[PDB]
Amino acid sequence: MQILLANPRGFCAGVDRAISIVENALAIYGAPIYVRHEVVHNRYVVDSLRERGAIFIEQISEVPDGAILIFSAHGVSQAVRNEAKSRDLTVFDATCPLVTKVHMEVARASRRGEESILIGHAGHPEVEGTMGQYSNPEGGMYLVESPDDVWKLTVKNEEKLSFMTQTTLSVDDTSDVIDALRKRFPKIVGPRKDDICYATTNRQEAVRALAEQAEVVLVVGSKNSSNSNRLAELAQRMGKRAFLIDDAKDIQEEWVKEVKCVGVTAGASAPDILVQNVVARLQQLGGGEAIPLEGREENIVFEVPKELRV
Ligand code: F3S
């Protein structure tokens, strides 16, 4: 049984930075370091930081005066950001720069009183944070998940309209939404394509390459990780058996079956130890040596703020 590894896979530049922000704050200030919601959507990473002294909280309310507070990679709304400002807290922001980039566009639209439409998934923290950059009653900020949502939408002035996207969306699905948007609203302004990040685009291209080769695809990642669910869905959609798994324990022999070729990838918040565990398990189920697939170069690094360098 052949074992293929997708490339690129696993940590993105934003996840690397967010984790180093927490790890360095712990090294500099000692435990506890308070983090608002999971720093990234991976339970292995979150468990490991919590063991080292990070306390993951829900509400700024729960953080005592004088503490160190960290915002997650997904970003926060202005309301949350202003609440922390009003408190006696030291805050470091681990929001990925490629999310902040979207936040800045939503803010510009807001000051102009022009309506904006965000393509994303309701309930996701990144969406709460991006929608929460808009604050002008004369304009409006609307969320759209699907092409139908686009045809349902009523807008005050379709001559002054723009859109933005969540970073971790299906590129193909998002294209379908954007098509509807530009047909339904011909004067809508946007990016050339979308706000889907390099890491998502690349990971979905790598899993498509993987899935054309493999009968079964295991994607390493947690259930609340949007980008990891998009990986599994992409492979599933090409008619392959895909499974989102947190670790090697989750692998069921029935999946490995009489499969001639199994592929493994990882979402942007999953550590590579976990894919190595998965390979070790697959080899004990008759897998051979792991063959890495060739991939697009990634060369982007985002640095920790200077106060947190170690
Ligand atoms: S928006 Fe940023 S945090 Fe990772 S998944 Fe994309 S590089």
Swiss-Prot record:
GO CC entries: cytosol
Phenotype of gene-disrupted mutants: Cells lacking this gene are viable only if the medium is supplemented with mevalonate or the cells are complemented with an episomal copy of ispH. A conditional E.coli lytB mutant shows that LytB is essential for survival and that depletion of LytB results in cell lysis.
Binding site residues for isopentenyl diphosphate: H41, H74, H124, S225, S226, N227, S269
Top EC class of this enzyme: oxidoreductase
Listed Pfam families: LYTB
Coiled coil: none
Pathways per UniProt: Isoprenoid biosynthesis; dimethylallyl diphosphate biosynthesis; dimethylallyl diphosphate from (2E)-4-hydroxy-3-methylbutenyl diphosphate: step 1/1; Isoprenoid biosynthesis; isopentenyl diphosphate biosynthesis via DXP pathway; isopentenyl diphosphate from 1-deoxy-D-xylulose 5-phosphate: step 6/6
pH and activity: Optimum pH is 7.0.
Keywords associated with the record: 4Fe-4S, Iron, Iron-sulfur, Isoprene biosynthesis, Metal-binding, Oxidoreductase
The protein's Enzyme Commission number: 1.17.7.4
Keyword Zinc-finger included in the entry's annotation: no
Cofactor: [4Fe-4S] cluster
Effect of H124N: Loss of catalytic activity
The keyword 4Fe-4S is assigned to this record: yes
Binding site for dimethylallyl diphosphate: H41, H74, H124, S225, S226, N227, S269
Active site, UniProt feature: E126
Note on how the cofactor is bound: Was shown to bind 1 [3Fe-4S] cluster per subunit. However, it initially contains a [4Fe-4S] cluster which easily degrades into a [3Fe-4S] form in the presence of oxygen.
GO MF annotations in UniProt: 3 iron, 4 sulfur cluster binding; 4 iron, 4 sulfur cluster binding; 4-hydroxy-3-methylbut-2-enyl diphosphate reductase activity; metal ion binding
CDD domains tied to this protein: lytB_ispH
Subunit structure: Homodimer.
Functional description taken from the UniProt entry: Catalyzes the conversion of 1-hydroxy-2-methyl-2-(E)-butenyl 4-diphosphate (HMBPP) into a mixture of isopentenyl diphosphate (IPP) and dimethylallyl diphosphate (DMAPP). Acts in the terminal step of the DOXP/MEP pathway for isoprenoid precursor biosynthesis. In vitro, can also hydrate acetylenes to aldehydes and ketones via anti-Markovnikov/Markovnikov addition.
Similarity-based family: Belongs to the IspH family.
Protein name: 4-hydroxy-3-methylbut-2-enyl diphosphate reductase
Phylogenetic lineage: Bacteria, Pseudomonadati, Pseudomonadota, Gammaproteobacteria, Enterobacterales
